[PDB]
Structure formats: C-alpha cells, structure tokens
C-alpha cells in the first residue's frame, strides 16, 4: 500500500464513512486523468489504491467528496469536494497517508510520509 | 492592543459570538492569578484586554469557553474549553492575535505574531 | 468588497506575505475559466479581486500558490497548492472570507460567509 | 485501550515521535492529579494508558509537551503545550483517540470516538 487516504468528521467525532474518493494523475497535455477511486470504510479508511509498481513519480490529485457526505447528514456544506494535489517522489522506499478532517465550512489536510 | 482573540465557528461558517474568554498569568509561586476576561463581539473578535504597560514578560493562559457556546446551539461537544499556553515578550514587546477555529469535536488555534 | 482571501504561516506565527493566488469559475460548457488574480499584501491579505456587479452566482475555485511561498523560504512543501472550490452566491449575495492557514505537509481552509 | 494518543508532525510530514504525553483526572477539591503517561513511539501514537475498570465518567487532561519536541529539532515554538480537556461519558462501549496535528505556532486536535 503505497498509498492510502482517511477521513474524519468533526461535527459527530467519529470516521467519516462511506465517503467517495477519487485519484488522478496529471498527464503531459497536462489533463487530469482517472486513476483510481473508492469509498472509505468503517474506520473511515481507504486501502489498495494502487500498487508500488503503478504508482509512479508524477504529479497526482486526490478529490474527496465532503459535499455527498455532509448532505447526507443533513448539513449545509460550503465547498464542493476537498482536492489534494502533490508531486510523489522516490527517495527511498515511501508510504503515503493522506488524511483530511471535515467540518461543513472548513477542512484541513495532512501528508504522513513513511519508510 | 498587545492582545486580541478571534474565534470563528466552522460549521456554521461565522464568527463565533458572545463567546467568554479569560486570561490568567503565572505568578512566581507558580499558581494561575486571574489577568484578564471578555466576550467575543459581532465579528467574533475580543479586542482591549490589556494595555502595553500592564502585558509584561511571563507565561500566559487564555482560556476559551467552548463547552457554553456549543451549548447555546443545542450540541453537546466533546472538549470543556479550548486553552492557549504561551511565554510572551521575551524578547521585547510583541503583538499577539490568537485565533481559535471551533468544531463540536475538534479545535485549532494559531497565533500571529508581530511588531 | 464581496471575496477576501487571508494566508497565514504556521510555521513563522506570521501572514503570509507575497502569495499568488488565482481565481476561476466554471462556465456552461463545464471548463474554468479565468476570473481574478492578485498577491497576498504585508498582513496576508488580498482585497479588491472582484465587485458586486461581476460576482455573479457560480462554481468558483480559489488556487493559492503556496508551493512558490514554502521554496522562497527554502523548504521543500507537499502540496502543489491549495484549492478551495465552492458555490457562491445562490441564496442571493453574500460576502465571503476565504482563510487558509499554511504548514510545510498540512494545510486548513475555513470560510467566513457574512451578510 | 479505552483511550489512545496520537500525535502527528506538520512540518516534517511524520507521526511526532518521543513526544511526552501526561494524562490527569479532575478531583472533587478541583485541583488536576496524575492518572498516566508515556511517550509517542515511533508511529507517533500513545497505547496502554488506561484499562476499562480505571478509566470512569470523569473530567480528563491529555497535556502534549509540544515545546521539548520542537526543541529537539531546532524550531522556535510558540505553545507552552498542547492541553486538551474533556468529560468522559459512558452510554454504550466507547474507545477514545485524542489526535493533535502540530505546528511550531499552531495546532489542531480532534476526538474520534468509537464503538
Ligand atoms: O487565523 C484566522 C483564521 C483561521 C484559519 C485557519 C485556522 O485553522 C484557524 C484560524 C481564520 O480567519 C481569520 C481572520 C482574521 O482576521 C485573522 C485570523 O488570524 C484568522
Ligand atoms: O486526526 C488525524 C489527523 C489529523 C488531521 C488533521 C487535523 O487537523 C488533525 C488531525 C491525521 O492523521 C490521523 C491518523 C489517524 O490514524 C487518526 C487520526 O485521528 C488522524
């Protein structure tokens, strides 16, 4: 697991679950383009992205759908999804968390970067 | 002013109003002696809690009552208060903005320093 | 003025000064298009991008270059930038405070919607 | 593990390793007495502190000693420490995670509680 995403609810103080994610990376017409996706589990985690063979140097975008997540709660929300973009590089062997906390009008996000 | 607090609540995505803050500083028997307090305003700002002759060197807490705004709302969140420790003026005298970000259970602070 | 974006250093306790930010919204064939641009000013402020005439009710991204920030102060950041993507304006108009506060790995945006 | 500390480093984008966590339970006299303490491992997180039978409905103190950490690596902090104060409650089975995500002049923190 060369990379992974998880993601918390501040409002109810708990994972945030069943929240859509997708992953892209940028290609050299500079277009964003799929590359996997999936929905957080009850820990509010996502695993099996992508293997360490398929994920490499490049520049790629995680989008994390806050919006369907807080609609489903019954709270009025302000941005429409929670983007990450970052350049992953090979330094040595590397693990990437990334994870975002919610709340309907802010969320902040942080890079784990292991091994 | 030396001091001012700013606290902005995120769910709803305003400052956060009428919200009690209380300032203490440590004596040299190192107890807590009661400095300064006040209520946050309109713009969720707390502005003249002390003067450029009263703020000296020491360690100082402001304590944020959280726990009472969240109540007001009708939520019951997870934290009693958020509490800011910090050394100020140690290298002569500064200006300090402490802002506070309130979710029902989380908190953030930052402080700006200038001057 | 109707958009107000403020950057922060967490890092330094400081604004963010000097950071280029970059505002688009997306148009009816589902592109983004340029709507405004400027740098953040000595308290980290950006004032003036738009008016209320030309701040219609949209899709809008905010994109702060915070990359170009971090490596003019010699590190080396995670994130490419930070993008805020939200809908403005569609319960009639509204003034909108854009905050983000900024770490090497890390960042949090909140919103502050008033009026 | 009824309650689990984890602690997490903005600025390197790492788990905050050997970080000194002490824990106290609010008295009826009202001062704050001893209860547990340790320090982060290298995954930056905090187990064994409690047991189910010792850790009853009661006011806690969770204080993070941010300034050694940021000490040891050469950065000027702002923050004495990171406090974080709650009411501990039962209704069904809780597992308490007390997260902080730190900065040399801001922090967050966040309760996920589960089961
Ligand atoms: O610090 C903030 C924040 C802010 C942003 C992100 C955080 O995590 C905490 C506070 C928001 O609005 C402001 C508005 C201000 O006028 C001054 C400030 O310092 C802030
Ligand atoms: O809370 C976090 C955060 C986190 C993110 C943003 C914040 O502002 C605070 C904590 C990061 O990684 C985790 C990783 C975990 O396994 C559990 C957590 O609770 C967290």
């Not at 501040?10 to 799929?34: L, M, Q, Y």
């Not at 099996?48 to 709660?73: M, N, P, R």
């Amino acid at each position: 697991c060369p990379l992974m995403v998880k993601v918390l609810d501040a409002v109810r103080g708990s994972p945030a679950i069943n929240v859509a994610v997708h992953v892209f990376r940028k290609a050299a017409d500079d277009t964003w383009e799929p590359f996997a996706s999936g929905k957080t589990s009850e820990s509010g985690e996502l695993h099996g992205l992508t293997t360490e063979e398929e994920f490499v140097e490049g520049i790629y975008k995680v989008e994390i759908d806050t919006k369907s997540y807080w609609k489903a709660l019954g709270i009025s929300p302000f941005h429409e999804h929670a983007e990450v973009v970052f350049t992953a590089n090979d330094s040595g062997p590397r693990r990437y968390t990334i994870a975002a906390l919610l709340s309907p009008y802010s969320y902040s996000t942080t890079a784990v970067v292991t091994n």
